[PDB]
Amino acid sequence: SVLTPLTEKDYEGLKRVLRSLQAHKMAWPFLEPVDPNDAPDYYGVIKEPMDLATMEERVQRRYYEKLTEFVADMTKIFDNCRYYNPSDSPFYQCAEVLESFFVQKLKGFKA
């Protein structure tokens, strides 16, 4: 189940998944913490920001104890983008595309 404790072998898969996402062409808005210059009032709207650089740090530090927690931070990144941005937005579409890529990759890691 997704509650099972992460092993050292699992962490190699998570590193692989994370780097697949960082390399994706649509991932550029999510690579680093949002710069307030790039999004007005972002940190007034979004009370739990998340990004792929923060998850990478968390992976390197063995922050994650069960896969569900890794999935949770990833889903915040997508949730935040879709709440902050209107469905019209190319940033919104970036979340649509990258979340679908994440599901494919997550299914693969689970297998």
Write the interaction track for ligand 6FI spanning residues 3-32; mark x where CB under 6 A is met and - where it is not: --------------------------xx--
Q: Is 13 exposed, middle or buried (0-12, 13-18, 19+ CB in 10 A)?
A: middle
Out of 13, 39, 97, 101, the only residue in the binding site for ligand 6FI (CB under 6 A) is: 39
For residue 85, state whether it binds ligand 6FI (rule: CB under 6 A): yes
Half-sphere exposure of 65 (CA within 13 A, CB side): 0
What distance in Å separates the CA atoms of residue 51 and residue 80, rounded to the nearest whole number?
Answer: 10
Q: Tokens for 47, please give them.
A: 């009370």
For residue 35, state whether it binds ligand 6FI (rule: CB under 6 A): yes
SS3 content of the chain, % helix, strand, coil (to 5): 70, 0, 30
Out of 12, 38, 57, 65, the only residue in the binding site for ligand 6FI (CB under 6 A) is: 38
For residue 48, state whether it binds ligand 6FI (rule: CB under 6 A): no
Q: Which stretch binds ligand 6FI (CB under 6 A): 2-10, 14-22, 84-92, 100-108?
A: 84-92
Shortest distance (Å) from residue 35 CB to ligand 6FI: 4
What distance in Å separates the CA atoms of residue 13 and residue 26, rounded to the nearest whole number?
Answer: 21
Q: Tokens for 31, please give them.
A: 């690579």
Q: Which residues sit at the interface with ligand 6FI, rule CB under 6 A?
A: 29-30, 34-35, 38-39, 80-81, 84-85, 91, 94
